[PDB]
Amino acid sequence: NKFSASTVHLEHITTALSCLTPFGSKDDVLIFIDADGLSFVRENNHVIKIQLLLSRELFMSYSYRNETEDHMKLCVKINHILDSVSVMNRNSDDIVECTLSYDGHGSPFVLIFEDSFISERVEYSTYLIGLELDRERISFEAIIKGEALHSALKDLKEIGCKECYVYAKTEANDENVFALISKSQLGFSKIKLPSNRSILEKLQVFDGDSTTVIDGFAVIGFFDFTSFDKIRKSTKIASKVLFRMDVHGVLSVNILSQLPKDYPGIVIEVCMLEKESIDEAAQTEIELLMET
C-alpha cells in the first residue's frame, strides 16, 4: 500500500470528523495524505471552508510509502466515513484497532477495524478531483475561550438569528469589548463577552496592516448565521478559539483543542466569507446600539 496507518484512539477521530457534521451532511470530502499526516478539507458553496490536521504522531503505524508525489489527494463521501469511525470502541479490554489504507490512484480507501473477535472491512471508492485570509491586512485579532463562544453560538442558534454581526473595538484605557449582534425574529440581540483575561484573553484591533494597534475604532463583520453555525460544534471541544478577520471580509477561526503524548491536538481551521451588506444604514444602528 502507498499509505497505511493504525490507531487505537477512535474517540478523537470520531469527534474530529463530527466537527464536519455541521457542514454538508452527505457530500464529498477531500483528503490530503503526506508525511506530516492527513487532512480533511471541506467547502460549502465557495463561501466557507473547514480543514482538519490529524498529525502523524496521533497514529502509531503511519508509513506513507508514496514517493512519486509529495501528497496524495482523494475525494470520497463523508457520511459513511463518519459511520465507519463511529465504532465508539467500547469494552476497554479489547480495544478496536483501526487501519487506514490507500494504494494510490484507482484503489479504494479501506478502513479495517479489528476487535480480535469481530473483523470489519469498509472500502470507499474515490471520485475525480481559495478561502484564505492574507497575513498582512488583518483588521482585528481575538482569542476567546471555547466554552464562552460555544455558549454564545448556542444562544444565537436558539433565538433564530437569521443574520449575525461581529463587534471588535479597542480603547486607550486597555478596555476591550467583543459582542455578537444578531438579526432575528426578536429584533436586535447582542451577546457581549467579558473583558476579563479568563475569556477574552487577547483582543487587538489594527488599521488594516496587522501592525499598528489602533484604539477607539470598531471593526464590523456581517456574516450569514448559516455559515456561523458551522463553527458551533468545532468550538464545543475547543480549549481556546482564535479569531481573525482582514479588511477583505474573510473570517478565520483557529480551533486549538490541546491519547499520544507527542501529537499537538487537532488543528481545525475554519474560513468564512463576509456578507456584502448593501444597506449602509444597518451598521449605523449597530454602532448606535453599541455606544449605549
Binding site: 463521501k77 473477535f117 469481530i118 473483523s119 472491512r121 470507499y124 471508492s125
Partner: peptide, 11 residues
Amino acid sequence: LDWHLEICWNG
C-alpha cells in the same frame, strides 16, 4: 454502488 462492508464474527 461505491462502498462495501464486511463485518465478520471471528468468535
